[PDB]
Structures are given as structure tokens and as C-alpha cells.
Ligand binder design. Structure first.
Ligand code: HEC
Ligand SMILES: [Mn+2]
Ligand SMILES: [Mn+2]
Length: 106
């Protein structure tokens, strides 16, 4: 449950959503992402290892996962309503979140 493994979970399950052709597989990938992002939110990334947990950098690092989970839930709702294609498109826009946090802190 460390940061690199959670990121492996996020990356793998985004590719799963991208190639999926059914709702069950999209839904399982998304809920798995949701869990991995909440667990990642507890880690300290290598480039913030000198920071206090209440620093603005650490606050912003953690809050990035709230935004990510928010997108995941939107996609989760489409995917529970059976709209696989809309859910996949929503998951593609998650990529702005990955990129945003990465350019600041990876
Ligand atoms: C901060 C709020 C993050 C968001 C959102 C996402 N990622 Fe991330 N990721 C983050 C950091 C700080 C790091 C560096 C970790 C380290 O220990 O060096 C990463 C790294 C990755 C990696 C590489 C992991 C590795 O084994 O080196 C991948 C493949 C990755 N991140 C993917 C990824 C995806 C697909 C995300 C959105 C669905 C995503 N990350 C969001 C911080 C944050
Ligand atoms: Mn915010
Ligand atoms: Mn966003």
C-alpha cells in the first residue's frame, strides 16, 4: 500500500477502462482506482520528504487526490447507469489530474 504500488494500480486500471467493452469491467477498475487514490493520499512523495504534513505543498498534494476521487465518482455514476462510453470518456479527463499532480511533485 505504498505510493508506487498505488500509482501502478491507477495506471493499470486506467488502461483497463480504456480497453474495456463492458460496464462491469469499467466499474471494477474505477472502484479500484478510488481505493488506490485514497491510500495514496496518505503517503509522502520523495520530492516532499523534507516537508511538514501541514505544509501547503503537502496540503496540495493530498487535495489532488480529492479532485481525482471526485472525477472517479462522476465516472462511477455513469458506469453504474450502464453508460460505458460516457464513463470511459470521463475517465479520459482524469488524465488532467494525473498530469497536474505529476508536474508539481513527481
Ligand atoms: C497527486 C495528487 C497524484 C495524482 C492525482 C496522481 N499521481 Fe501518479 N504519482 C504521484 C507522485 C508524487 C509520483 C512519484 C512517486 C514516486 O515514488 O516517485 C507518482 C508516480 C506515478 C507513476 C510512476 C510510479 C513509479 O513506479 O515510479 C505512475 C505510472 C503514475 N504516477 C500514474 C498515475 C495515474 C495514471 C494517475 C491518474 C489516474 C496518477 N498517477 C495520479 C502523484 C500523483
Ligand atoms: Mn480543491
Ligand atoms: Mn479536475
Amino acid at each position: 500500500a505504498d505510493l508506487e504500488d498505488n500509482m501502478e494500480t491507477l495506471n493499470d486500471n486506467l488502461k483497463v477502462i480504456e480497453k474495456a467493452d463492458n460496464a462491469a469491467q469499467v466499474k471494477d477498475a474505477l472502484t479500484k482506482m478510488r481505493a488506490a487514490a485514497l491510500d495514496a493520499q496518505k503517503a509522502t512523495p520523495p520530492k516532499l520528504e523534507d516537508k511538514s504534513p501541514d505544509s501547503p505543498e503537502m496540503w496540495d498534494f493530498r487535495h489532488g487526490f480529492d479532485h481525482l476521487v471526485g472525477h472517479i465518482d462522476d465516472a462511477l455514476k455513469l458506469a453504474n447507469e450502464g453508460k460505458v462510453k460516457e464513463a470511459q470518456a470521463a475517465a479520459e479527463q482524469l488524465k488532467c489530474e494525473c498530469n497536474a499532480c505529476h508536474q508539481k511533485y513527481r
